Each structure stands twice: as C-alpha cells, then as structure tokens.
C-alpha cells in the first residue's frame, strides 16, 4: 500500500530508493504525479514554508498532502539517514526542483523520532503517524486542484 517508489536524489549528499506512504490528505494520483527521481534542488527555512502553506490554504486553490518516506534496502537506509541528518542539523527543509505538472511544490521535512509534529500539519487527515517511530523524512506536496 505504498503510493510511489522512486529515488530521492540530492547531489553531493545522498541518493536512494524509497517508498512513499500516505500520511495526510488525499494521496490520489501521486503515482502519476511524482517523477522517477525527486531531485532535491535546495533548502529553505521552515518558517518560510509554513507562512506559504498558510496562504495556500487561505487561497483555496490547492490540495495539500503529506507522505512519509521509507528506505527500500539497508543500503538505502544509510543514505536516507545522511539526508535526514543534513536537513535536521541545519534546521532546513529540502525543496524539490523537478516537479511534474500537477505539483506546484514539494518539500522534504525531517521529523525526529522525539519531535513534535509541526502544528500546520496537525491534525492529520489520513493514517497519520505512529507515536513510536524512527526518524523520518516527510514529503509536503502542494498540488493543483481541478
């Protein structure tokens, strides 16, 4: 019941195969809307994302969904961890640079195992996350509405 399997690729940092699972919002059509390899093009301050997400919700023109990434093999898990640490240590989110037509924005969020969920994502409208969990990379996906 993963909705997409593909690479995350941050040049000079980490590249790995991952499966995405739904967390919040409708994951419908994500299999067609995500590229084979999500290219991480840069980094962004979390407050900038949350200010933007507030405007997105106010505008009523987009759908927000949240997925969680899991490494596929033990080798993937080493690089997944490097990427988590990259953004966690710098208190940044990642920015996808090769979005497909239906996705306006995609951010990669490190969520520490003992972290509180960022408030603009609560409440989760979907399976959510387990209380007892590893360090995780989430994807925050802004999609166009019909």
């Amino acid at each position: 019941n993963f909705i997409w399997k593909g690479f995350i690729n941050m040049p000079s940092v980490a590249k790995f195969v991952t499966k995405a699972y739904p967390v919040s919002g409708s994951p419908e059509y994500l299999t067609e809307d995500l590229p084979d390899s999500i290219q991480v093009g840069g980094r962004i301050s979390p407050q900038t994302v949350w200010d933007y997400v507030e405007k997105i919700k106010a505008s009523g023109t987009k759908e927000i969904c949240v997925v969680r990434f899991t490494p596929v093999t033990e080798e993937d898990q080493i690089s997944y961890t490097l990427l988590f640490a990259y953004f966690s240590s710098r208190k940044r989110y990642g920015v996808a640079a090769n979005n497909m037509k239906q996705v306006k924005d995609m951010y990669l969020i490190p969520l520490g195992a003992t972290d509180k969920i960022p408030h603009p994502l609560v409440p989760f409208d979907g399976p959510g996350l387990e209380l007892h969990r590893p360090n995780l990379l989430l994807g925050l996906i802004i999609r166009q509405k019909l």
């Binding site: 940092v13 840069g42 980094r43 962004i44 900038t48 405007k55 997105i56 306006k104």
Partner: peptide, 13 residues
C-alpha cells in the same frame, strides 16, 4: 488566489 512559490537557497553544483 494563487500564491507564488517562495524563493529558496539552491544547493546543487
């Protein structure tokens, strides 16, 4: 209405 995406800090060489 349609908010413009925020700028960010590019990382990739």
């Amino acid at each position: 209405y349609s908010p413009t995406s925020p700028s960010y800090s590019p990382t990739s060489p």
